Design a protein around this ligand. Structure first.
Ligand SMILES: [Cl-]
Ligand SMILES: [Cl-]
Ligand SMILES: [Cl-]
Ligand SMILES: [Mg+2]
Ligand SMILES: [Mg+2]
Ligand SMILES: [Mg+2]
Ligand SMILES: [Mg+2]
Ligand SMILES: [Mg+2]
Ligand SMILES: [Mg+2]
Ligand SMILES: [Mg+2]
Ligand SMILES: [Mg+2]
Ligand SMILES: [Mg+2]
Ligand SMILES: [Mg+2]
Ligand SMILES: [Mg+2]
Ligand code: NA
Ligand code: NA
Ligand code: NA
Ligand code: NA
Ligand code: NA
Ligand code: NA
Ligand code: NA
Ligand code: NA
Ligand code: NA
Ligand code: NA
Ligand code: NA
Ligand code: NA
Ligand code: NA
Ligand code: NA
Ligand code: NA
Ligand code: NA
Ligand code: NA
Ligand SMILES: [Sr+2]
Ligand SMILES: [Sr+2]
Ligand SMILES: [Sr+2]
Ligand SMILES: [Sr+2]
Ligand SMILES: [Sr+2]
Ligand SMILES: [Sr+2]
Ligand SMILES: [Sr+2]
Ligand SMILES: [Sr+2]
Ligand SMILES: [Sr+2]
Ligand SMILES: [Sr+2]
Ligand SMILES: [Sr+2]
Ligand SMILES: [Sr+2]
Ligand SMILES: [Sr+2]
Ligand SMILES: [Sr+2]
Ligand SMILES: [Sr+2]
Ligand SMILES: [Sr+2]
Ligand SMILES: [Sr+2]
Ligand SMILES: [Sr+2]
Lengths: 145, 119, 115, 246
RNA sequence: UAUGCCAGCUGGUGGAUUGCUCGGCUCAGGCGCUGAUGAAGGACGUGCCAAGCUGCGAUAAGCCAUGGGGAGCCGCACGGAGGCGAAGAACCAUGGAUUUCCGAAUGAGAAUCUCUAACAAUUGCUUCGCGCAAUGAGGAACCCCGAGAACUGAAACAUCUCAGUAUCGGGAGGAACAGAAAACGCAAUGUGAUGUCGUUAGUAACCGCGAGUGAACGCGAUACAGCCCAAACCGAAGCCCUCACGGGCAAUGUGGUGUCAGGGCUACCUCUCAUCAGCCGACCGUCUCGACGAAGUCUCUUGGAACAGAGCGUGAUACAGGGUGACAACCCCGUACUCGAGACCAGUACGACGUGCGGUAGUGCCAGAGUAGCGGGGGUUGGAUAUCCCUCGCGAAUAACGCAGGCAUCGACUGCGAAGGCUAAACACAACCUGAGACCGAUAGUGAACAAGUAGUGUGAACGAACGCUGCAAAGUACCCUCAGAAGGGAGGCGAAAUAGAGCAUGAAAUCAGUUGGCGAUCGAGCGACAGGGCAUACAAGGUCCCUCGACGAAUGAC
RNA sequence: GCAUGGCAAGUCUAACCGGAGUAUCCGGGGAGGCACAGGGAAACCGACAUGGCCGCAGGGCUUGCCCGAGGGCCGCCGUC
């Protein structure tokens, strides 16, 4: 049995005095009425802030952490096995509707890897090299200077 | 259709030429064999036997066939009014069985005997 | 008010074993499964790998998921495993149902709860 | 496991591997959900006329004549819900979404589970079906599809000690209530479900309570009418195998 | 025991309830224009008897033909009389005939009539004559172009909101509108007419930066289709009416060429299957309508009736639904299967006729002006500097030029050619047809199951109800008595039932008449709850209860 | 938010397409949404698959002592 189903006979259906549930007065005005007066509490404050650059001048990079790559080395058998050699671009999803692929350095790298991507974070290298691996910046990646 | 309201409606409001089918009665064993049909449209000439009402068992000649009310009058199947007069007690054909046909009409006989069509 | 007849039987069986054998885990696990679904365990392999030890049956009062890497040779016992989870585990160890575990160890000994 | 195959005479004629799906654990809750959804999804939207009771300029006289402030026209109360001939306060509405969603995976699991309930004789009998057989479901040679006469299917079923279920469904019930006024006067027990592979069995379909289906599209309602698992089924050699990959 | 209180009984009153459904409500599919060749609508007529409805129109519930259909028929509507039908009626489909007056209403006028040959009025053509033609008005909504609120929200209120909503003016169709880039701008080595649907997204943008308002490109789909002029170069090579003769139009340009895969011209290569025009002309599919169509009306019992129970039997590519004196696959209509016709798809697709695609070189020959663009003032929009439009003023270039890419200018780059035009399909609606339903079931559902937009109200605009059910069959009560009496009553007849006898299935409560039990003319008012006494009680559906004594014997507890 | 259920580092399809027993239903459709990294107005940069100590449930042992998921207090890392 639901709460609704138990209201018959109650008269006020949980509203308290029958004088309460009327028009918008019972809500202090309609919608966000009073967000700066009687109901200012917990409301975002008033005001403008910052700016926005045009959407067609904005770049959306596709990122991935070494942790994701590294954990799936063996499973990624469909990708080079050298002295592994993996082109991140062939690994990252949504890597099409993105302007470039960037490898981030979150996690560990328990293997020696030769990674190919448009860009890497400082920590991404330090780890990949630290595990006897190498990092190769793509032709597009040749936009750092 | 499948809806009862429409079914009864199509029956009560059917035009005259479509009411003949509302006065059809099953044929005797012989006649079914003779004309290759299970039933026919009861004519005011045929002979029929009552198989259901209070007059079940009686046989007689059909004296009248009312298409408007989809009912038939059979000789001797009557009720006695208060004044004493005798009036027919209308019968639904589905409670009757034809045991002898009146083929005085070439078309009916022709229709009955044809195979592609039934009477 | 569980809806799944199997989960319901698992719980009954989990209580039978705890009450009849020298096990406190089974009844313990039974109490947690009785709790709302949102509180049940949802564990990835990366966590089993970090706190499990061989020859010690891992007991998950929930479901096991496939993220991370498991290398230790352990017998993981859970209410259910995702397809990938049961695959990775079976490679380096073994995936088992609480129903099996309860049968091969009613006393519920040498077992570690993970969530 | 293995399932015994039968020929149109009803004699054993070899046997085949009962596919793995029939081993799927029976889940009456999932099956019930699936049936509940198919049943809801074919329901038609309805609702009272949105202007019903509103076609009137009726007005209240307010205070003054010792009368309740009820809109009136020609001395008659109207429009308001407490007024005879007034609008319906919270009536059925056409805009209401009367359908139920169901994840494809969850739905498919239900089909498999319903298929599996078909292989458990005890369940099938608990569901209500009448039969003096031990093995279930009933598997038959693909020549079953070539049958044409209903009675020829009767003979086979009697030879298979399964015709008793049709005798069960050979009783219609004239329901209580006004469903009758809307064309729902009768109802009847569900009997045997025939699952063929090329086309539904035209020869079996008219059997009392019988349902016919094709392995490629047989659904949960087919396997578990009303959501109750364990329908006495009869598959076709090929149907049995094609159903294996649902 | 008067007046009277409480409960019940018999009979009323009343029309709840239960059951029933010829009406609603909603959804889905199909279909879709009518009118001066006088529509839609209205008025008045029209029947043997005819008030209402329906039909019809002085040939008036109908006339003729072809096909279907069939032994009956003369509408709703069960009367009386009479008639029609084998000379094949009724009825149905298609086509035709008749079709009063008012009505856009059109000779003039007028509350449906009148007065003395009429496209009135506005137009095009014109034989300049109303000679040939067009327009007008209607249609449930849908659609296109204009005009355009307020209540309301912002807890007041002015910008904002409600909302380009309500409502108004004009107009088309079966669908409208849009539409082959002076596009887009995931900026690209990329997309490639237009609707619409899903999404992009409550994102960008707007905003007393408050409340609120709110796209697009793209993407996935649906459906797909692309062309014609102006000019250049030609210059009467042309068009319209008429059978013809003949007439009219047309150098202020008919016609050819041509249309950003730019074109033309001069000189060449090659070739056409592009396009445009016309001819032919479906399959399939969908919707509807129709034909055909299996198998019990066997026994016994109950009943007024078998469609019930028990027994025996049968069909099924048919066990949807309905009817029939009660629960029916097999009694009747239908239903499955198969088959036929019409409508839509569609004058579409295919096919065929003709035309002829395209390429090189040269040539500043052509290519839409109050325009592009700027400024003042307004409105509008998400459009912010960067929306769309109106208004006042100003105002260009000529492809070697010009516009666009979300502030302005200049260069570069990329895209694209405005100021001419047409265009199928995919989408909206629901009048009309058919189908459907966990919708309502006569105070419900439409206002309307019935005389329903009826009766009735208002000067008018406009407002607007209520009314369903005899029975299997009318067998709808003969005869007699009474009475002023076709009334009513009594007796009687019918039927299973008249407590089914006319708003005639059932028949609640309030309440009324009569009456039974209890109380009652010396007595006090939330009408009762719980205890206990009196009196009252056919059966059934409850069977317990009382006294002596004895056993057990909590708290408590004596003489 | 919550209860239940499927699937799970993923999850769900929308319109719509094919089939069919033709509004149900079977198959297809991942466009796109939310989740899988954050911080910053922006430019732009880009993180603990565990380093320490407590310790509940549970497990172990030779019955106070170990292991101690979750949890608790810290460290440390990304960014302004
Ligand atoms: Cl930004
Ligand atoms: Cl985890
Ligand atoms: Cl594009
Ligand atoms: Mg014949
Ligand atoms: Mg109403
Ligand atoms: Mg009822
Ligand atoms: Mg006149
Ligand atoms: Mg206000
Ligand atoms: Mg505005
Ligand atoms: Mg304010
Ligand atoms: Mg707006
Ligand atoms: Mg755009
Ligand atoms: Mg009504
Ligand atoms: Mg009555
Ligand atoms: Na209240
Ligand atoms: Na009204
Ligand atoms: Na709806
Ligand atoms: Na139409
Ligand atoms: Na009349
Ligand atoms: Na006429
Ligand atoms: Na005219
Ligand atoms: Na003239
Ligand atoms: Na206010
Ligand atoms: Na005010
Ligand atoms: Na504003
Ligand atoms: Na894209
Ligand atoms: Na009958
Ligand atoms: Na201006
Ligand atoms: Na552009
Ligand atoms: Na009524
Ligand atoms: Na996706
Ligand atoms: Sr409350
Ligand atoms: Sr109010
Ligand atoms: Sr509020
Ligand atoms: Sr303030
Ligand atoms: Sr995507
Ligand atoms: Sr009639
Ligand atoms: Sr009649
Ligand atoms: Sr006053
Ligand atoms: Sr196209
Ligand atoms: Sr031009
Ligand atoms: Sr710029
Ligand atoms: Sr009434
Ligand atoms: Sr209505
Ligand atoms: Sr007045
Ligand atoms: Sr009498
Ligand atoms: Sr004692
Ligand atoms: Sr899916
Ligand atoms: Sr921790």
């Amino acid at each position: 049995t639901s709460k609704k189903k138990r209201q018959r006979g109650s008269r006020t259906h949980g509203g308290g005095s029958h004088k309460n549930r009327r028009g918008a007065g019972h809500r202090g005005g309609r919608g966000d009425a009073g967000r700066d007066k009687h109901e200012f509490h917990n409301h975002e404050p008033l005001g403008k802030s910052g700016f926005k650059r045009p959407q067609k001048v904005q770049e959306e990079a596709a990122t991935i952490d070494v942790r994701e790559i590294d954990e799936n080395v063996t499973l990624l058998a469909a990708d080079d096995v050298a002295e592994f050699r993996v082109d991140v671009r062939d690994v990252v999803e949504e890597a099409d509707d993105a302007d470039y692929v960037k490898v981030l350095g979150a996690g560990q790298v328990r293997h020696e890897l030769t990674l190919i991507a448009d860009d890497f974070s400082e920590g991404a290298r330090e780890k990949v090299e630290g595990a006897g691996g190498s990092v190769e910046l793509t032709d597009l990646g040749e936009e750092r200077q | 259709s499948k809806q009862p309201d429409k079914q009864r409606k199509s029956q009560r409001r059917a035009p005259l030429h479509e009411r003949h089918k509302q006065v059809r009665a099953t044929l005797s064993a012989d006649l079914r064999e003779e004309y290759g049909q299970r039933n026919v449209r009861v004519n005011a000439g045929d002979t029929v036997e009552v198989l259901r009402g209070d007059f079940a068992g009686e046989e007689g000649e059909v004296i009248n066939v009312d298409l408007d009310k989809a009912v038939i009058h059979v000789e001797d199947v009557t009720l006695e009014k208060t004044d004493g007069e005798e009036v027919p007690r209308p019968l639904d054909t589905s409670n009757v069985r034809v045991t002898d046909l009146d083929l005085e009409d070439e078309k009916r006989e022709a229709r009955l005997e044809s195979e592609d069509d039934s009477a | 008010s569980k809806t799944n007849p199997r989960l319901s039987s698992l719980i009954a069986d989990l209580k039978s074993a705890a009450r009849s054998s020298g096990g406190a885990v089974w009844g313990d696990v039974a109490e947690r499964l009785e709790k709302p679904r949102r509180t049940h365990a949802e564990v990835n392999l990366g966590r089993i790998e970090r706190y499990a030890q061989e020859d010690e049956t891992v007991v998950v009062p929930g479901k096991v998921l496939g993220s991370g890497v498991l290398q230790k040779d352990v017998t993981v016992a859970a209410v259910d495993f995702s397809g990938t989870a049961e695959t990775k585990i079976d490679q380096v160890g073994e995936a088992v149902s609480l129903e099996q575990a309860i049968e091969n160890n009613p006393e519920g000994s040498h077992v570690r709860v993970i969530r | 496991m293995q399932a015994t195959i039968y020929d149109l005479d009803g004699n054993t004629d070899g046997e085949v591997d009962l596919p793995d799906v029939f081993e799927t654990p029976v889940r009456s809750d999932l099956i019930g959900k699936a049936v509940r959804a198919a049943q809801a999804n074919r329901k038609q939207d309805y609702g009272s006329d949105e202007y019903a009771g509103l076609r009137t300029p009726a007005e209240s006289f307010g205070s003054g004549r010792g009368q309740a402030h009820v809109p009136k026209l020609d001395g008659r109360a109207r429009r308001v819900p407490q007024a005879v001939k007034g609008r319906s306060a919270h009536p059925p509405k056409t805009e209401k979404d009367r359908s139920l969603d169901l994840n494809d995976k969850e739905r498919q699991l239900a089909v498999r589970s319903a298929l599996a309930a078909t292989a458990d004789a005890d369940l099938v009998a608990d569901r209500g079906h009448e039969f003096d057989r031990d093995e279930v479901p009933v598997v038959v040679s693909d020549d079953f599809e070539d049958l044409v006469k209903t009675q020829e299917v009767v003979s086979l079923l009697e030879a298979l000690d399964v015709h008793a279920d049709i005798d069960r469904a050979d009783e219609t019930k004239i329901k209580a209530g006004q469903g009758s006024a809307r064309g729902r006067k009768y109802r009847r027990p569900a009997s045997i479900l025939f699952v063929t592979s090329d086309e539904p069995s035209t020869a079996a379909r008219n059997l009392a309570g019988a349902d016919v289906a094709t392995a490629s599209e047989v659904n949960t309602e087919d396997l578990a009418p009303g959501g109750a698992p364990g329908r006495l089924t009869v598959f076709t050699e090929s149907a049995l195998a094609e159903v294996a990959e649902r």
